[PDB]
């Protein structure tokens, strides 16, 4: 089988701008093992039939895992705009994989405030699909070459989510795993009954 008890239950989910890409191959990929996740979790996918993904198979399964708040889990989809889908993690419009997201208020929220999860806020452009940026160069919009220090229009691009248990469903930490299947000229070796 694929290891799905090594992606969905990892103790270390990275922040969104540094999403961890994990290649899974040589399997019998059973997606009926995901019943014992969180009581409500969004299993929506595109380009494959969700009643037939256990019989159609692929050369590789790329799983990307990150943590975002609930207000912006909508942007984890092709053809979406926002902070995440433009500046942090963009899905291509030719997407052939599945987007899985569940609430993680138990694991990722401290009463003092969980500051370990950061998102990119200003980056002077957009992101091409499946491209990350771990760059921490100081953002430049004003007409000052003062990059060593903060200024009027010079900001540090990464900002913190500040997860707390006193916040709405839009601000609760939603751990996201996006499987990204690909079909190529190689033999598949992922499918099985």
């Amino acid at each position, epitope marked *: 089988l694929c290891p799905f008890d090594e992606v969905f239950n990892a103790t270390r989910f990275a922040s969104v701008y540094a999403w961890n890409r994990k290649r899974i191959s040589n399997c019998v990929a059973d997606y009926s093992v995901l019943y014992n996740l969180a009581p*409500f979790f969004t299993f929506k996918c595109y380009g494959v039939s969700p009643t037939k993904l256990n019989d159609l198979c692929f050369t590789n399964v790329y799983a990307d895992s990150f943590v975002i708040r609930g207000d912006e889990v*909508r942007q984890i989809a092709p053809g979406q705009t926002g902070n995440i889908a433009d500046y942090n993690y963009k899905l291509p419009d030719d997407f052939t994989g599945c987007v899985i997201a569940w*609430n993680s*208020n138990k694991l990722d929220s401290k009463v003092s405030g969980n500051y370990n999860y950061l998102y990119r806020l200003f980056r002077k452009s957009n992101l091409k699909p499946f491209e990350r940026d771990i760059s921490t160069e100081i953002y430049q919009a004003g007409n000052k070459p003062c990059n060593g220090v903060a200024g009027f229009n010079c900001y540090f691009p990464l900002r913190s989510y500040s997860f707390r*248990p*006193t*916040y709405g469903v*839009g601000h609760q930490p939603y751990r996201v795993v996006v499987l990204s299947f690909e079909l190529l000229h190689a033999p598949a070796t992922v499918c099985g009954k």
Partner: antibody, heavy 123, light 107 residues
Framework: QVQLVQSGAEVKKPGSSVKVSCKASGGTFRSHVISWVRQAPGQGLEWMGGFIPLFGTTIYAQAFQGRVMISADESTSTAYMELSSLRSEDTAVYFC??????????????????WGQGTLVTV | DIQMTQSPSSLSASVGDRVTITCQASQDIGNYLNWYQQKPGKAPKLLIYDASHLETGVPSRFSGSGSGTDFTFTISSLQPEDIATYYCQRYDDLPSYTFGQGTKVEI
């Protein structure tokens, strides 16, 4: 400055259905779950149901399971509770509420818990 | 389902006294309890969240306690503006809440 406002007091007759609205004041209707609480005029509060605007799923109380229907209009920030089959026992002040975890980091001056003003439904 | 029996439902105390309100759940819920205050004719207000903390703007006379099933609402010194009804509410991670029978505090 989020201020939940409602429709108004509706007198009814038994057997009919009532739909009561709750228009939130602000652009952050999608973030917070909105939930409906009824209070009988002498008794304590009772939870009815809730609508999560993130995914559209609903959670209903097991005493009002199959009787109530909660939907929303996200383009105008208004959540509708469609109570059906009114009876003599269903005479209550119906609050719309953003029960406790609906605070936000932006503008902490509004508290974690935000309630409505109450709709008096009389049969 | 979880039903929670809050007692006493009707007490009475003078000004400057100590008021203790007890909310007992039917099974283990952890710190998931919030304490409300409904003055008559108005919407309820939140005082204690997660059974111990304090809402911003609420004076420090109120203080909750308890974790397992036996919780406890305490008012330090009673005031004329605390004549109301107090409800204990059972928050869950899936948003399902259960209120209490209420405790009417009379001067």
């Amino acid at each position: 400055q989020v201020q939940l406002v409602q429709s108004g007091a509706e007198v009814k007759k038994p057997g009919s259905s009532v739909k009561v609205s709750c228009k939130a004041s602000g652009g952050t209707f999608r973030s917070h779950v909105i939930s409906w609480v009824r209070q009988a005029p002498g008794q304590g509060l009772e939870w009815m149901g809730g609508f999560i605007p993130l995914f559209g799923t609903t959670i209903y109380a097991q005493a009002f399971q199959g009787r109530v229907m909660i939907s929303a209009d996200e383009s105008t920030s208004t959540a509708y509770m469609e109570l059906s089959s009114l009876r003599s026992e269903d005479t209550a002040v119906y609050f719309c509420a953003r029960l406790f975890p609906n605070g936000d980091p932006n503008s902490p001056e509004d508290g974690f818990d935000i309630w409505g003003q109450g709709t008096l439904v009389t049969v | 389902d979880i039903q929670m029996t809050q007692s006493p439902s009707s007490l009475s105390a003078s000004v400057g006294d100590r008021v203790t309100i007890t909310c007992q759940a039917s099974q283990d819920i952890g710190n998931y309890l919030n304490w409300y205050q409904q003055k008559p004719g108005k919407a309820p207000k939140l005082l204690i969240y997660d059974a111990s903390h304090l809402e911003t703007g609420v004076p420090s006379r109120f203080s909750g306690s308890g974790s397992g099933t036996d919780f406890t609402f305490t008012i330090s010194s009673l005031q004329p503006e605390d004549i109301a009804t107090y409800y204990c509410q059972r928050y869950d991670d899936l948003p399902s809440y259960t209120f209490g029978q209420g405790t009417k505090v009379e001067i």
